[PDB]
Design an enzyme around this catalytic site. Structure first.
Site, PDB file in Angstrom:
ATOM      1  N   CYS A 180     -24.396  70.841  31.568  1.00  0.00           N
ATOM      2  CA  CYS A 180     -24.251  69.898  30.466  1.00  0.00           C
ATOM      3  C   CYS A 180     -22.811  69.431  30.306  1.00  0.00           C
ATOM      4  CB  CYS A 180     -24.744  70.531  29.168  1.00  0.00           C
ATOM      5  SG  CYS A 180     -26.316  71.410  29.336  1.00  0.00           S
ATOM      6  N   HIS A 319     -21.464  70.581  20.907  1.00  0.00           N
ATOM      7  CA  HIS A 319     -22.540  70.647  21.889  1.00  0.00           C
ATOM      8  C   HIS A 319     -23.887  70.405  21.219  1.00  0.00           C
ATOM      9  CE1 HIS A 319     -25.038  71.924  25.190  1.00  0.00           C
ATOM     10  NE2 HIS A 319     -25.476  72.975  24.521  1.00  0.00           N
ATOM     11  N   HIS A 357     -29.940  65.075  24.473  1.00  0.00           N
ATOM     12  CA  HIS A 357     -29.100  65.877  25.358  1.00  0.00           C
ATOM     13  C   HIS A 357     -29.146  65.260  26.747  1.00  0.00           C
ATOM     14  CE1 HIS A 357     -26.912  69.311  26.842  1.00  0.00           C
ATOM     15  NE2 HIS A 357     -27.841  69.530  27.754  1.00  0.00           N
ATOM     16  N   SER A 621       8.968   5.352  42.001  1.00  0.00           N
ATOM     17  CA  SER A 621       9.512   5.081  40.665  1.00  0.00           C
ATOM     18  C   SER A 621       9.392   6.352  39.831  1.00  0.00           C
ATOM     19  CB  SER A 621       8.812   3.845  40.096  1.00  0.00           C
ATOM     20  OG  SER A 621       9.340   3.496  38.829  1.00  0.00           O
ATOM     21  N   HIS A 875     -63.329  88.247  31.856  1.00  0.00           N
ATOM     22  CA  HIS A 875     -64.078  88.596  33.064  1.00  0.00           C
ATOM     23  C   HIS A 875     -63.242  89.562  33.895  1.00  0.00           C
ATOM     24  CE1 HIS A 875     -66.216  88.314  36.867  1.00  0.00           C
ATOM     25  NE2 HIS A 875     -67.202  87.695  36.244  1.00  0.00           N
ATOM     26  N   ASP A1054     -71.247  82.565  33.117  1.00  0.00           N
ATOM     27  CA  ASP A1054     -71.225  83.964  33.523  1.00  0.00           C
ATOM     28  C   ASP A1054     -72.162  84.803  32.664  1.00  0.00           C
ATOM     29  OD1 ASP A1054     -69.725  85.901  35.381  1.00  0.00           O
ATOM     30  OD2 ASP A1054     -69.501  86.873  33.426  1.00  0.00           O
TER      31      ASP A1054
END
Lengths: 1111, 117, 117
Positions: A180, A319, A357, A621, A875, A1054
């Site tokens: 950072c 920060h 950020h 001239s 299970h 099941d």
């Protein structure tokens, strides 16, 4: 002064920003910061469909808990490659971070008031701070389709190396990466380089872009990212930080260097200390003591006492990432550095709350926030701060987080506003910067340039809009900034106008026209108009508008007074005819001669003030006299005096004008004798006479009165003089008809072409026929610039001589940034890479569909771990958590649904055929990851016949070191539609013994089936005659990421399977002496409509019947 | 002796092959992958382990990265703010991403050796 | 070494006409990933239709047979006979230029591994 500090203070001369919320320029960035809005948004699908990776659990495999980011609204694929001479292949290879860095560096250079040519080849330094290289992992995820220039386009170092390469710079080019803090660390390195004096300029830049989910998944694995999607600085809602996109370029120079170069200062980086956290409680954990030491050392190195309020900063860009643990550490560090040794509070505002950020450029984002705050004297607020975090309150006693655009606190007199910038990168590299505001103790042509004619037209349009928006800005400052403080580019167009209204109308005319020039040449050929070419009211606008021209008029009046009383005064046309509005005719010699001579004298003086180097050719001239002045050996006063005294031709090889019944004839032959006699008593640059042919083109005999007499008596050999001047100086660049143009344009240019066979040189007239003098001179300057860049003339010196009051301010800050073409989008969306970034929702039990999946072939890739699947712990077999055999069936049915959706078909009926469970999946622990790859090839897509046969295989791998092995396979026969299917259930068996569900599951656990929680889910069952029937909970299962229910919760299927065991074995009979697991199914048939209806209706409790055919 | 001091670190790495290899499959990514593969951590973690408080830069100027880091360390030491500076570099061949990228430009030597001049 | 990542770094030779086998390929399911461009395949410029360089219809057959060979090698089996059944060319591959890259993904699921038979 402010430059007396122990280390030379560095100053931000310019900045270029691409920040989220349309903040594509420093002004917009400041407006956002002081007036923040909810910039953060869901990650655009154009970048990557985060919904394909979103999941509430950040630690979930291959998912991110932060589906929000402060993303740039700009299309990063767009890029003005033609501007940087980058080929299309390389531009696609380029990391968008590098492209936006180039754009922002150029924007800052423009805002700094520096030209590319001025910095071209110099020792300017570059220090780029990037934490993320998402493009390098995205464009290179599929090694195939990698472009040829991918290495240099995505290599991190190239982020700075390419900036220097484009700008021809020779200073250090570092691509820093301190996480950072990367950008602020780069700022520190730039400060050190500038203080060494080895680099006249340093680009401290940063770049972070969200181009792929790699960084998102990596950071969410640690819960670093904020699930709320925002960086709630020092807030009780602190749950991480929100990733942001930003590319910031900051031009840095030594304060003395900037002042001597006259750059528009933004702020002064007095000191930039860098320190790192020690062996903190975790690599990501920052150290408050380390940051406190950093702040103290930074203030000490700046000659500033931390304890003293005068030396201590009033603002502190923290920060402030919203991290649950980092924010308290930062607050403690700030409080201890500035307090704890013991009353207004100290303002702390983190830029990461407003723009997010931005990782590598987070430091530079905070630096820009502090810079704008100190420059405008306004403390920008922090959008996300509702309640102080409890962990931050102890250290928040002496600190305040502004939620409004609070004005700067009170300051001692003579003390600049002081702000601090702090950036902590994971790993602990902390960079702290101390910033202070700098105390600061006739119109030029409006020049515009671009690398493309389209870009130049957009430049003109944007400049017109800006002028309409900023009519208050002084025209001289704007033109000077566009001339000297702005880069010159191959496509050029210069506008002409006395004032803002005139400049706007001229901009409109130029836009309508579309005529623009394309691609150290200050030399000009001074061509002087002779008598008879004068127009009414010459110099009226110049005299009335320019005080410098007024002083020249005073000099002309003094010269007039210098005449002998015999002829003095030749009536003052300067005050009789050079008047706006009247513009009376002037053809009489008494006025035409001195008027033209004064016009040409003023024009040549202005051109010299512009530092234009001349090669002079005399006309006839007044033109001859003015040219004699232009030689640099004849005083202006002498020339105008001679013209006044005289008041009382072979133009080209194919154009001549011999006057008569006039000059150069017997009419003026005797009249010139008294003129010469009075001239005897009345009065450095290459110079070519036309009165004589190469014999008196000298610097000593031109002063003789005989030459002045011959000027009006000899046939002017203007063509011969032009030939001599051009042939001698073959490197001539342009010729200017100084005076009352047009008088010699066609003949003079024809002579130039004839002498230089087939070579046409530039021609220009600084005073046009009956046109505004200001406009004519501005158009001449425009021609010069469009033809020979800034080297044509020095606008700074011209403004120094003309209108010395109010020296032009470099307003390049306010001028619009260069409009980048953006016509073409340069990106590498390899279709596999695109299907990775984009794609379907991450279907549960299946994961993300493979990048190389067709509408006919599919391969869903998943890494199942029990804790991610909340229900999978139920299970359990032999204690081990085993993926249910019904789980494979549910996955296959969901694959069938997704396949049908891919073809837009809807499954009226879903059959499975010859399914097999070759290998059961064993989960060692709830966190263990087992890869499941459901391949599915539709062998027969017969939607015409209303059927679809799909061969499916659920491959499994229990460990990363193991090979991928088959866990289940079979076929799926779908009865589909373009958008009662099953037999009615058998009549319930008459006699059925009630089954004690708890005892049944106890027996199963004894045998080995450790079914638990959701997998038990058997409301009631009764068995008899090898059959079983009852009620089971059709519990619904829905994928939050996919936002839709599943056909079956593997728990229910099941349980249905357990019904077979119950029929086979009664509770407590121990018929199930061994643990049976499914290994093959002849056919599973499911009606998805009914299952979905039951799941959504809430009637999960459903009935069942089962036949234990073989026992 | 160096624990807790202001010793600096300047790491020069051009290649992050592991970050593209370990993260090529977003699944199976370890929890600490971000800090384990992030380039800046190359120096930040050195300082963290040694408890150092000097600057920790992970420079990347391509082939020159490490020598540029040496230059930055020299500047830091001459400033006197760091009693010691670790000018380090790292390049490892863990994946073909860099190899393919460089061979796309023919930068790599097909003969397999850098035959100087 | 994520097993997909390992199969990417490691794996079989990059079989021509097929490329590298996909990281997520099983002994039962295979998906060879390739990005064919005519200049890389020296012989592919020959099969041009209507001026356009078209991947030969026999190219798909050759790719399928090579996939069969690789599958048999994966199971250690050797093919005494190689039959193709009900093959179809739904869409011809058109190469705009010799440098144009066209992705080819040869998926192959062995519906019946009956080496016993």
């Amino acid at each position: 002064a402010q430059s007396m500090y122990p280390n030379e203070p560095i100053v931000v001369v310019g900045s270029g920003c691409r920040f989220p919320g349309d903040a594509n320029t420093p002004s917009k960035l400041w407006e956002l910061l002081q007036h923040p809005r909810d910039v953060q948004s869901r990650i655009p699908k154009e970048r990557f469909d985060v919904d394909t990776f979103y999941h509430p659990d950040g630690k979930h495999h291959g998912r991110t808990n932060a589906p929000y980011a402060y993303v740039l609204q700009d299309d990063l694929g767009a890029f003005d490659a033609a501007f940087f001479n980058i080929q299309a292949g390389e531009a696609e290879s380029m990391d968008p971070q590098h492209r936006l860095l180039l754009e922002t560096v150029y924007e800052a250079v423009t805002n700094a008031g520096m030209r590319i040519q001025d910095l071209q080849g110099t020792s300017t330094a570059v220090y780029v701070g990037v934490m993320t290289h998402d493009y390098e992992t995205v464009s290179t995820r599929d090694l195939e389709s990698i472009p040829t220039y991918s290495a240099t386009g995505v290599a991190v170092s190239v982020a700075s190396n390419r900036i220097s390469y484009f700008f021809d710079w020779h200073g250090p080019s570092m691509t820093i990466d301190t996480a950072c803090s990367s950008s602020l660390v780069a700022v520190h390195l730039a400060v050190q380089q500038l203080r060494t004096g080895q680099s006249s300029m340093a680009i401290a830049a940063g770049a972070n872009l969200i181009l792929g989910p790699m960084t998102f998944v990596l950071e969410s694995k640690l819960s670093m990212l904020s699930p709320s999607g925002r960086s709630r600085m020092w807030d009780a809602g602190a749950d991480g930080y929100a990733r942001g996109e930003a590319v910031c370029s900051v031009v840095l120079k030594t304060l003395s260097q900037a002042l001597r170069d006259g750059d528009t200062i933004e702020c002064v980086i007095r000191e930039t200390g860098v320190n790192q956290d020690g062996r903190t409680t975790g690599i990501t954990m920052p150290n408050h003591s380390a940051q406190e030491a950093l702040i103290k050392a930074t203030y000490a190195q700046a000659g500033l006492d931390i304890t003293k309020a005068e030396d201590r900063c009033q603002f502190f860009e923290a920060h402030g990432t919203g991290t649950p643990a980092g924010d308290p550490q930062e607050a403690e560090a700030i409080a201890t550095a500035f307090f704890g040794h013991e009353r207004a509070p100290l303002f702390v505002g983190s830029a990461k709350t407003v723009v997010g950020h931005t990782e590598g450029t987070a430091g530079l984002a905070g630096l820009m926030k502090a810079s704008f705050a100190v420059r405008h004297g306004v403390i920008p607020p922090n959008l996300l701060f509702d309640k102080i975090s409890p962990r931050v309150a102890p250290f928040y006693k002496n600190l305040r987080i502004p939620t409004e655009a609070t004005q700067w606190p009170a300051l001692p007199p003579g003390q600049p506003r002081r702000a601090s910038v702090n950036s902590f990168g994971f790993g602990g590299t902390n960079a702290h910067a101390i910033i202070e505001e700098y105390m600061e103790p006739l119109s030029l042509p409006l020049v515009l340039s671009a690398k493309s004619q389209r870009s130049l037209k957009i430049m003109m349009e944007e400049m017109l809009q800006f002028l309409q928006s900023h009519p208050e800005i002084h025209l001289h400052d704007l033109t000077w900034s566009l001339l000297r403080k702005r880069s010159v580019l191959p496509f050029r167009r210069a506008i002409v106008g006395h004032s803002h209204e005139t400049i706007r109308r001229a901009l409109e005319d130029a836009i309508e026209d579309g005529i623009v020039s394309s691609d150290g040449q200050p030399s000009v050929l001074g061509i002087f108009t002779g008598q008879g070419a004068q127009w009414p009211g010459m110099l009226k606008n110049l005299i009335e508008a320019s005080p410098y021209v007024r002083n020249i008029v005073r000099e002309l009046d003094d010269s007039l007074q210098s005449l002998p009383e015999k002829y003095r005064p030749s009536w003052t046309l300067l005050d009789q005819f050079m008047l706006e509005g009247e513009a009376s005719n002037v053809q009489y010699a008494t006025f035409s001669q001195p008027l033209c001579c004064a016009v040409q004298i003023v024009l040549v003086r202005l051109l010299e003030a512009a530092r234009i180097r001349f090669t002079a050719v005399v006309g006839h001239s007044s033109g001859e006299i003015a040219c004699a002045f232009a030689a640099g050996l004849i005083s202006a006063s002498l020339a105008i005096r001679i013209a006044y005294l005289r008041g009382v031709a072979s133009n080209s090889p194919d154009s001549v004008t011999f006057s008569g019944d006039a000059y150069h004839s017997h009419h003026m032959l005797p009249c010139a004798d008294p003129y010469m006699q009075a001239l005897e008593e009345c009065g450095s640059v290459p110079w070519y006479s036309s009165v004589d042919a190469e014999n008196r083109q000298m610097a000593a005999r031109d002063v003789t009165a005989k030459y002045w007499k011959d000027n009006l008596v000899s046939p002017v050999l203007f063509s011969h003089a032009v030939q001599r001047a051009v042939v001698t100086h073959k490197a001539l660049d342009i010729g200017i008809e100084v005076g009352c143009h047009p008088a010699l344009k066609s003949p003079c240019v024809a002579t130039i072409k004839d002498v230089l066979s087939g070579v046409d040189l530039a021609y220009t007239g600084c005073l046009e026929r009956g046109k505004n003098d200001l406009d004519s001179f501005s158009r001449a300057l425009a021609y010069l610039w469009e033809r020979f860049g800034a080297s044509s003339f020095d606008a700074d010196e011209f403004m120094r001589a003309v209108a010395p009051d109010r020296p032009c301010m470099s307003v390049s800050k306010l001028l619009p940034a260069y409009p980048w073409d953006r016509s073409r989008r340069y990106w590498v969306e390899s279709r596999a890479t695109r299907h990775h970034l984009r794609g379907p929702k991450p279907h549960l039990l299946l994961g993300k569909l493979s990048e190389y999946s067709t509408p006919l072939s599919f391969q869903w890739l998943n890494f199942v771990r029990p804790r991610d699947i909340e229900w999978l712990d139920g299970h359990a077999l032999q204690g081990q958590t085993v993926f249910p055999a019904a789980g494979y069936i549910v996955m296959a049915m969901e694959a069938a649904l997704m396949i049908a959706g891919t073809h837009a078909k809807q499954v009226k009926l879903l059959e499975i055929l010859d399914m097999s469970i070759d290998k059961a999946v064993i989960f060692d622990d709830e966190d263990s990851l087992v890869e499941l790859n459901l391949t599915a090839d539709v062998s027969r897509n017969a939607g015409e016949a209303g059927s679809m046969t799909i061969s499916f295989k659920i491959d499994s791998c229990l460990s990363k070191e193991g090979n991928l092995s088959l866990s289940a396979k079979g076929q799926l026969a779908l009865t589909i539609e373009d958008v009662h299917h099953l037999p009615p259930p058998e009549e319930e068996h008459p006699h059925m013994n009630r089954v004690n569900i708890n005892a049944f599951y106890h027996e199963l656990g004894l045998m080995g089936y450790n079914y638990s929680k959701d997998f038990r889910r058997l409301h009631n069952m009764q068995r008899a005659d090898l059959r079983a029937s009852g009620t089971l909970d059709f519990i619904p299962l829905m994928d939050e990421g996919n936002g839709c229910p599943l056909l079956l919760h593997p728990a229910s299927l099941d349980v249905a399977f357990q019904t077979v065991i119950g029929a086979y074995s009664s509770p407590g009979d121990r018929r199930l002496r061994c643990l049976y697991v499914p290994t093959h199914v002849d056919r599973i048939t499911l009606v998805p409509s009914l299952c979905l209806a039951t799941a959504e209706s809430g009637c999960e409790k459903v009935a069942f019947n089962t036949i234990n055919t073989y026992d």
